[PDB]
Amino acid sequence: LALSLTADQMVSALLDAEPPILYSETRPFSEASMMGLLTNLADRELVHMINWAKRVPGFVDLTLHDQVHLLECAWLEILMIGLVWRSMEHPGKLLFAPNLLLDRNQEGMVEIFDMLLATSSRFRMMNLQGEEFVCLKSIILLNSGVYTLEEKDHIHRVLDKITDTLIHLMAKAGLTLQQQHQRLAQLLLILSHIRHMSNKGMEHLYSMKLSDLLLEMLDAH
């Protein structure tokens, strides 16, 4: 199936599956208005994410039930790592949308804001490549809800493939075997923080509980 694609084909498949950077709806004010815009943006981003997940190698080979569960578990993670990726070359700011640069000084928002900023600074420090990013984002989709009759060795097989995919990229980058293990570890340890930001982000969302699709994703927690 999708467990035969080479490292190059794996990358190309993920790169071609990449969703577009959606725009938001430029004066000043407001906290309600602020989270109204982020809700509207995330809601439209969800639709692209759902159809992005379909193009992820191995995801279509799973049942409708599992596909729902995996997306319900990691939708905020995928959104946030995408946000962090956008804001790489924008130090001190978050690129929610090409027409939306927010700094830290603009409930619970600024706490997650700083964590998101720190994550982006980490990507900049490590000089994260787009080929590595699409791998990490795909790992999130498959790994986040894998431990929450039916075997999931297929998911592990795809995950092991993406691991090989990541390593193959770094070996082509001229990194030594020691440097290959290390940076691999560094990338996957960030997913722990991405999970954390999602959890903190999730609970703040169902504490102010407006989008219909978001309500279903949010009630899943």
Binding site: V47, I50, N51, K54, L64, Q67, V68, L71, E72, D212, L213, E216, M217
Partner: peptide, 9 residues
């Protein structure tokens, strides 16, 4: 669920 429907459509 909308999510299940969008995974179908």
């Amino acid at each position: 669920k909308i999510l299940h429907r969008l995974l179908q459509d």
